From a paper:
The N-terminal OB domain of the RPA70 subunit (RPA70N) is a major protein-protein interaction element for RPA and binds to more than 20 partner proteins. The RPA70N domain adopts an OB fold with a five-stranded anti-parallel beta-barrel but has very weak ssDNA affinity.
The C-terminal part of the kinked BLM peptide fits onto the RPA70N groove, with F556, I558 and F561 making contacts with the hydrophobic patch of RPA70N, while RPA70N residues R41, K88, R91 and R43 form salt bridges or hydrogen bonds with BLM D560, D552, D562 and the main chain carbonyl group of F561. Interestingly, the N-terminal half of BLMp2 latches onto the α1 region of a nearby RPA70Nb. K16b from RPA70Nb forms several ionic interactions with BLM D554, D557 and D559 to neutralize the negative charges. Using ITC, we found that BLMp2 binds to RPA70N with a relatively weak KD of around 18 μM, and that mutation of BLMp2 residues (D560A, F561A, D562A) almost abolished the binding between BLMp2 and RPA70N.
Residue numbers in the entry: 4 to 125, 550 to 564
């Protein structure tokens, strides 16, 4: 049911027109100050996870209403990939539909490894500088 390999497709091939089915692993606000929340997401395609997702603030009602939460499965309908000054490419989710609630799925799907650290095959890349989890937690 998840679009296995879609995270690599977005990050490696630049595919911006695909509509993949992903699982939300974690949601977190970018800052905790007194301001309208802006959420970052750790998403999974079942093979890899990627933490460089931001939810467009127009979609915040999905989070405030608890429709989008950890372990739910959603389909992305529109996104763009933006690059920060330091080089990091961040996927901005603009439109999405929750297909299965967190409660309905019940559990994390598969055994995904972080995209920065490993392959879609479940193995970890050679990391001679011990740095490739820098953008994960």
């Amino acid at each position: 049911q998840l679009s296995e390999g879609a995270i690599a497709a977005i990050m490696q091939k630049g595919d911006t027109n695909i509509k993949p089915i992903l699982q939300v692993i974690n949601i977190r606000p970018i800052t905790t100050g007194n301001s309208p929340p802006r959420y970052r997401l750790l998403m999974s395609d079942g093979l890899n996870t990627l933490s460089s997702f931001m939810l467009a603030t127009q979609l915040n009602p999905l989070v405030e209403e608890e429709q989008l939460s950890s372990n739910c499965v959603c389909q992305i309908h529109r996104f763009i990939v933006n690059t920060l000054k330091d080089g990091r490419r961040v996927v901005i989710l603009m439109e999405l539909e929750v297909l299965k609630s967190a409660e309905a799925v019940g559990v994390k799907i598969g055994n995904p490894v972080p995209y920065n650290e490993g392959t879609s095959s479940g193995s970890y890349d050679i990391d001679n500088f011990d740095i490739d989890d820098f953008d994960d937690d």
